[PDB]
Amino acid sequence: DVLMTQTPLSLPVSLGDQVSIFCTSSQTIVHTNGNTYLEWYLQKPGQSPKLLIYKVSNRFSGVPDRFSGSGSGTDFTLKISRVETEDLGIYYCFQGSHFPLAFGAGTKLELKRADAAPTVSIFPPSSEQLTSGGASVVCFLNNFYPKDINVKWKIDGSERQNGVLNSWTDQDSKDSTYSMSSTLTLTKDEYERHNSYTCEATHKTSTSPIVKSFNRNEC
Amino acid sequence: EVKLVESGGGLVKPGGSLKLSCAASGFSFRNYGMSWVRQTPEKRLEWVASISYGGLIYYPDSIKGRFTISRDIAQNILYLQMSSLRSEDTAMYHCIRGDSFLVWFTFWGQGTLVTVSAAKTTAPSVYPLAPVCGDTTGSSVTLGCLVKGYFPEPVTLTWNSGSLSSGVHTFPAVLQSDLYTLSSSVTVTSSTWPSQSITCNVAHPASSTQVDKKIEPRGP
Ligand SMILES: C[C@]12OO[C@](CCC(=O)O)(c3ccccc31)c1ccccc12
């Protein structure tokens, strides 16, 4: 089968910027009728995908003149001459020259801005949850930039890679930063079997992780 | 005006069956090729099946055998019979009209959601997230709300009934074990809270749930 590979998976841009998104097919994609069915789609947040370019370079009627497609062999490119706020979203490439038809993973067009260290907040189990027998330890690493970030948990000094659920927000529409929540879920008994709970964030702004924690008995 | 409207999507137990429909307008099925394409929770687009204006049918090996596409040319309705369903089959299904040997997916419908799960309607557990004494020594303070183990999605969480809007981050729900868990955080001035009231309002329509949790400072 032919696999489509898109790069980058995230393209931070500034408005007015000229951009190029790439799509690589695992092999040549020429239909036996000689046409190259390489299509480009843009999906706006909350909307279904919309056609931009078909057969490599044909801009679909109604699509802005700043979008264009090109490429050959196994290399294909989508270009936006002067990025606008409306162009933000995720672009997808697709090959339909050979079955099975295949989509690329997509490239997210995002906004550039100044680096931002995350604000880290740790929250011990609630007394209500404890009562029911549960113990969720949550941590928030908020408003950071770039979006890349690592979170490490430590219980009584030892790392806890197991039992962690993370979620990420999309880029904030107001300050263009990113946030992430990390919840260590334990049991009332398990939680009571340790005193120190630490949440560490590794952002390109810290290297030496931002550390936040509490003690089950003291603060 | 070309129009495509998907229906039939819904909750279905694994190994179960579901029939999806797609009512078209503005064109004839005898003149255009139709396809079904799905977007997974991870936002991955996947080709499900297609039928040419002449009736020729194609499926990828993963869908082959399990799903069946057909069409009612007279009533202009595209169908997708789904069987042997699995959690990976959970996605938004779109019927698409394309132009013969020109463009595969020229026009997409808004889609219909199909959720494959064994879970049963479960109300969420809402817990107030109060700061630790070491984080409350600054000019601002972040509060939180943990909405745990509910089904199905979604829930509606607000702060002070929506009164509290800025500085909020409600994170996307994730599966904890066939059940969803979500959390929200709100950051305000230290003089705002606990000086002023802050409550987490969570609703879960599927279970007729509407709970409120006021964040109280910790400590004996
Ligand atoms: C829209 C479309 O028209 O005809 C084909 C091929 C027809 C064939 O391979 O027999 C096709 C090929 C390339 C781009 C679009 C299409 C097709 C098949 C199935 C669904 C939609 C289409």
mmCIF file with all atom_site columns, all heavy atoms in Angstrom, chain A residues 2-16:
data_model
loop_
_atom_site.group_PDB
_atom_site.id
_atom_site.type_symbol
_atom_site.label_atom_id
_atom_site.label_alt_id
_atom_site.label_comp_id
_atom_site.label_asym_id
_atom_site.label_entity_id
_atom_site.label_seq_id
_atom_site.pdbx_PDB_ins_code
_atom_site.Cartn_x
_atom_site.Cartn_y
_atom_site.Cartn_z
_atom_site.occupancy
_atom_site.B_iso_or_equiv
_atom_site.pdbx_formal_charge
_atom_site.auth_seq_id
_atom_site.auth_comp_id
_atom_site.auth_asym_id
_atom_site.auth_atom_id
_atom_site.pdbx_PDB_model_num
ATOM 1   N N   . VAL A 1 2  ? 0.307  2.379  -0.402 1.00 0.00 ? 2  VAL A N   1
ATOM 2   C CA  . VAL A 1 2  ? 1.060  3.639  -0.414 1.00 0.00 ? 2  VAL A CA  1
ATOM 3   C C   . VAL A 1 2  ? 0.745  4.458  0.836  1.00 0.00 ? 2  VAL A C   1
ATOM 4   O O   . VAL A 1 2  ? -0.418 4.782  1.108  1.00 0.00 ? 2  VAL A O   1
ATOM 5   C CB  . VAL A 1 2  ? 0.730  4.502  -1.653 1.00 0.00 ? 2  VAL A CB  1
ATOM 6   C CG1 . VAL A 1 2  ? 1.725  5.677  -1.758 1.00 0.00 ? 2  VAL A CG1 1
ATOM 7   C CG2 . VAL A 1 2  ? 0.773  3.656  -2.902 1.00 0.00 ? 2  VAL A CG2 1
ATOM 8   N N   . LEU A 1 3  ? 1.776  4.785  1.603  1.00 0.00 ? 3  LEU A N   1
ATOM 9   C CA  . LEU A 1 3  ? 1.577  5.558  2.821  1.00 0.00 ? 3  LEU A CA  1
ATOM 10  C C   . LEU A 1 3  ? 1.973  7.020  2.594  1.00 0.00 ? 3  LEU A C   1
ATOM 11  O O   . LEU A 1 3  ? 2.971  7.301  1.936  1.00 0.00 ? 3  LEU A O   1
ATOM 12  C CB  . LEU A 1 3  ? 2.392  4.944  3.970  1.00 0.00 ? 3  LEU A CB  1
ATOM 13  C CG  . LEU A 1 3  ? 2.222  3.426  4.140  1.00 0.00 ? 3  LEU A CG  1
ATOM 14  C CD1 . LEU A 1 3  ? 3.097  2.945  5.289  1.00 0.00 ? 3  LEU A CD1 1
ATOM 15  C CD2 . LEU A 1 3  ? 0.753  3.072  4.386  1.00 0.00 ? 3  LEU A CD2 1
ATOM 16  N N   . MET A 1 4  ? 1.177  7.951  3.108  1.00 0.00 ? 4  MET A N   1
ATOM 17  C CA  . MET A 1 4  ? 1.501  9.371  2.952  1.00 0.00 ? 4  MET A CA  1
ATOM 18  C C   . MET A 1 4  ? 2.040  9.889  4.280  1.00 0.00 ? 4  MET A C   1
ATOM 19  O O   . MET A 1 4  ? 1.429  9.674  5.328  1.00 0.00 ? 4  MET A O   1
ATOM 20  C CB  . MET A 1 4  ? 0.262  10.191 2.541  1.00 0.00 ? 4  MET A CB  1
ATOM 21  C CG  . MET A 1 4  ? -0.398 9.764  1.222  1.00 0.00 ? 4  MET A CG  1
ATOM 22  S SD  . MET A 1 4  ? 0.696  9.607  -0.242 1.00 0.00 ? 4  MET A SD  1
ATOM 23  C CE  . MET A 1 4  ? 1.054  11.289 -0.565 1.00 0.00 ? 4  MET A CE  1
ATOM 24  N N   . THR A 1 5  ? 3.191  10.559 4.223  1.00 0.00 ? 5  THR A N   1
ATOM 25  C CA  . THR A 1 5  ? 3.839  11.106 5.415  1.00 0.00 ? 5  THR A CA  1
ATOM 26  C C   . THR A 1 5  ? 3.922  12.628 5.345  1.00 0.00 ? 5  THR A C   1
ATOM 27  O O   . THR A 1 5  ? 4.532  13.192 4.426  1.00 0.00 ? 5  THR A O   1
ATOM 28  C CB  . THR A 1 5  ? 5.272  10.522 5.575  1.00 0.00 ? 5  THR A CB  1
ATOM 29  O OG1 . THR A 1 5  ? 5.211  9.092  5.493  1.00 0.00 ? 5  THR A OG1 1
ATOM 30  C CG2 . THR A 1 5  ? 5.881  10.927 6.918  1.00 0.00 ? 5  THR A CG2 1
ATOM 31  N N   . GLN A 1 6  ? 3.298  13.290 6.313  1.00 0.00 ? 6  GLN A N   1
ATOM 32  C CA  . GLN A 1 6  ? 3.304  14.746 6.365  1.00 0.00 ? 6  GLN A CA  1
ATOM 33  C C   . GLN A 1 6  ? 4.281  15.329 7.378  1.00 0.00 ? 6  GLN A C   1
ATOM 34  O O   . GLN A 1 6  ? 4.444  14.809 8.484  1.00 0.00 ? 6  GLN A O   1
ATOM 35  C CB  . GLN A 1 6  ? 1.906  15.270 6.675  1.00 0.00 ? 6  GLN A CB  1
ATOM 36  C CG  . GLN A 1 6  ? 1.049  15.490 5.455  1.00 0.00 ? 6  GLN A CG  1
ATOM 37  C CD  . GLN A 1 6  ? -0.294 16.060 5.811  1.00 0.00 ? 6  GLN A CD  1
ATOM 38  O OE1 . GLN A 1 6  ? -1.277 15.331 5.939  1.00 0.00 ? 6  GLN A OE1 1
ATOM 39  N NE2 . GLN A 1 6  ? -0.343 17.369 5.993  1.00 0.00 ? 6  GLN A NE2 1
ATOM 40  N N   . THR A 1 7  ? 4.921  16.421 6.977  1.00 0.00 ? 7  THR A N   1
ATOM 41  C CA  . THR A 1 7  ? 5.879  17.127 7.813  1.00 0.00 ? 7  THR A CA  1
ATOM 42  C C   . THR A 1 7  ? 5.782  18.636 7.567  1.00 0.00 ? 7  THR A C   1
ATOM 43  O O   . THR A 1 7  ? 5.647  19.082 6.426  1.00 0.00 ? 7  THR A O   1
ATOM 44  C CB  . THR A 1 7  ? 7.317  16.671 7.515  1.00 0.00 ? 7  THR A CB  1
ATOM 45  O OG1 . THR A 1 7  ? 7.576  16.780 6.105  1.00 0.00 ? 7  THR A OG1 1
ATOM 46  C CG2 . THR A 1 7  ? 7.509  15.240 7.965  1.00 0.00 ? 7  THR A CG2 1
ATOM 47  N N   . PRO A 1 8  ? 5.818  19.438 8.643  1.00 0.00 ? 8  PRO A N   1
ATOM 48  C CA  . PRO A 1 8  ? 5.938  18.958 10.022 1.00 0.00 ? 8  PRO A CA  1
ATOM 49  C C   . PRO A 1 8  ? 4.530  18.676 10.550 1.00 0.00 ? 8  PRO A C   1
ATOM 50  O O   . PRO A 1 8  ? 3.537  18.982 9.884  1.00 0.00 ? 8  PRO A O   1
ATOM 51  C CB  . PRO A 1 8  ? 6.601  20.132 10.721 1.00 0.00 ? 8  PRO A CB  1
ATOM 52  C CG  . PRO A 1 8  ? 5.936  21.296 10.066 1.00 0.00 ? 8  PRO A CG  1
ATOM 53  C CD  . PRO A 1 8  ? 5.910  20.912 8.591  1.00 0.00 ? 8  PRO A CD  1
ATOM 54  N N   . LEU A 1 9  ? 4.427  18.071 11.724 1.00 0.00 ? 9  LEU A N   1
ATOM 55  C CA  . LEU A 1 9  ? 3.105  17.807 12.284 1.00 0.00 ? 9  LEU A CA  1
ATOM 56  C C   . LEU A 1 9  ? 2.559  19.099 12.909 1.00 0.00 ? 9  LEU A C   1
ATOM 57  O O   . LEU A 1 9  ? 1.382  19.198 13.241 1.00 0.00 ? 9  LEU A O   1
ATOM 58  C CB  . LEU A 1 9  ? 3.182  16.692 13.329 1.00 0.00 ? 9  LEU A CB  1
ATOM 59  C CG  . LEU A 1 9  ? 3.537  15.315 12.774 1.00 0.00 ? 9  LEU A CG  1
ATOM 60  C CD1 . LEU A 1 9  ? 3.300  14.282 13.862 1.00 0.00 ? 9  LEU A CD1 1
ATOM 61  C CD2 . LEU A 1 9  ? 2.681  14.993 11.536 1.00 0.00 ? 9  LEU A CD2 1
ATOM 62  N N   . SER A 1 10 ? 3.437  20.087 13.050 1.00 0.00 ? 10 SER A N   1
ATOM 63  C CA  . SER A 1 10 ? 3.087  21.384 13.620 1.00 0.00 ? 10 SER A CA  1
ATOM 64  C C   . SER A 1 10 ? 3.955  22.474 13.016 1.00 0.00 ? 10 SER A C   1
ATOM 65  O O   . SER A 1 10 ? 5.186  22.428 13.104 1.00 0.00 ? 10 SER A O   1
ATOM 66  C CB  . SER A 1 10 ? 3.270  21.373 15.139 1.00 0.00 ? 10 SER A CB  1
ATOM 67  O OG  . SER A 1 10 ? 3.295  22.694 15.656 1.00 0.00 ? 10 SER A OG  1
ATOM 68  N N   . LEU A 1 11 ? 3.299  23.450 12.398 1.00 0.00 ? 11 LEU A N   1
ATOM 69  C CA  . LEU A 1 11 ? 3.990  24.554 11.765 1.00 0.00 ? 11 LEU A CA  1
ATOM 70  C C   . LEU A 1 11 ? 3.626  25.876 12.403 1.00 0.00 ? 11 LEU A C   1
ATOM 71  O O   . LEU A 1 11 ? 2.553  26.418 12.137 1.00 0.00 ? 11 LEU A O   1
ATOM 72  C CB  . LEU A 1 11 ? 3.655  24.608 10.265 1.00 0.00 ? 11 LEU A CB  1
ATOM 73  C CG  . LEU A 1 11 ? 4.249  25.810 9.505  1.00 0.00 ? 11 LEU A CG  1
ATOM 74  C CD1 . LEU A 1 11 ? 5.774  25.716 9.532  1.00 0.00 ? 11 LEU A CD1 1
ATOM 75  C CD2 . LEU A 1 11 ? 3.722  25.865 8.070  1.00 0.00 ? 11 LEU A CD2 1
ATOM 76  N N   . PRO A 1 12 ? 4.504  26.405 13.283 1.00 0.00 ? 12 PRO A N   1
ATOM 77  C CA  . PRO A 1 12 ? 4.229  27.691 13.933 1.00 0.00 ? 12 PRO A CA  1
ATOM 78  C C   . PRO A 1 12 ? 4.546  28.783 12.918 1.00 0.00 ? 12 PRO A C   1
ATOM 79  O O   . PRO A 1 12 ? 5.617  28.807 12.335 1.00 0.00 ? 12 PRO A O   1
ATOM 80  C CB  . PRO A 1 12 ? 5.181  27.688 15.121 1.00 0.00 ? 12 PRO A CB  1
ATOM 81  C CG  . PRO A 1 12 ? 6.347  26.923 14.607 1.00 0.00 ? 12 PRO A CG  1
ATOM 82  C CD  . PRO A 1 12 ? 5.702  25.771 13.865 1.00 0.00 ? 12 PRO A CD  1
ATOM 83  N N   . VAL A 1 13 ? 3.597  29.677 12.696 1.00 0.00 ? 13 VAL A N   1
ATOM 84  C CA  . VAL A 1 13 ? 3.794  30.728 11.721 1.00 0.00 ? 13 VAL A CA  1
ATOM 85  C C   . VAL A 1 13 ? 3.407  32.092 12.281 1.00 0.00 ? 13 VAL A C   1
ATOM 86  O O   . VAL A 1 13 ? 2.820  32.193 13.364 1.00 0.00 ? 13 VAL A O   1
ATOM 87  C CB  . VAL A 1 13 ? 2.948  30.437 10.423 1.00 0.00 ? 13 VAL A CB  1
ATOM 88  C CG1 . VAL A 1 13 ? 3.485  29.217 9.713  1.00 0.00 ? 13 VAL A CG1 1
ATOM 89  C CG2 . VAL A 1 13 ? 1.476  30.198 10.784 1.00 0.00 ? 13 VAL A CG2 1
ATOM 90  N N   . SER A 1 14 ? 3.789  33.133 11.546 1.00 0.00 ? 14 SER A N   1
ATOM 91  C CA  . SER A 1 14 ? 3.437  34.501 11.882 1.00 0.00 ? 14 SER A CA  1
ATOM 92  C C   . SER A 1 14 ? 2.597  34.930 10.687 1.00 0.00 ? 14 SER A C   1
ATOM 93  O O   . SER A 1 14 ? 2.845  34.499 9.551  1.00 0.00 ? 14 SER A O   1
ATOM 94  C CB  . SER A 1 14 ? 4.675  35.389 11.991 1.00 0.00 ? 14 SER A CB  1
ATOM 95  O OG  . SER A 1 14 ? 5.586  34.874 12.943 1.00 0.00 ? 14 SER A OG  1
ATOM 96  N N   . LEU A 1 15 ? 1.592  35.751 10.938 1.00 0.00 ? 15 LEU A N   1
ATOM 97  C CA  . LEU A 1 15 ? 0.728  36.219 9.870  1.00 0.00 ? 15 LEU A CA  1
ATOM 98  C C   . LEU A 1 15 ? 1.558  36.959 8.812  1.00 0.00 ? 15 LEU A C   1
ATOM 99  O O   . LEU A 1 15 ? 2.533  37.658 9.136  1.00 0.00 ? 15 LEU A O   1
ATOM 100 C CB  . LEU A 1 15 ? -0.354 37.126 10.461 1.00 0.00 ? 15 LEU A CB  1
ATOM 101 C CG  . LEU A 1 15 ? -1.220 36.424 11.508 1.00 0.00 ? 15 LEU A CG  1
ATOM 102 C CD1 . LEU A 1 15 ? -2.102 37.441 12.220 1.00 0.00 ? 15 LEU A CD1 1
ATOM 103 C CD2 . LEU A 1 15 ? -2.075 35.361 10.827 1.00 0.00 ? 15 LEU A CD2 1
ATOM 104 N N   . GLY A 1 16 ? 1.172  36.791 7.549  1.00 0.00 ? 16 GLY A N   1
ATOM 105 C CA  . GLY A 1 16 ? 1.886  37.427 6.460  1.00 0.00 ? 16 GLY A CA  1
ATOM 106 C C   . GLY A 1 16 ? 2.986  36.520 5.957  1.00 0.00 ? 16 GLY A C   1
ATOM 107 O O   . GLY A 1 16 ? 3.599  36.795 4.935  1.00 0.00 ? 16 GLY A O   1
#
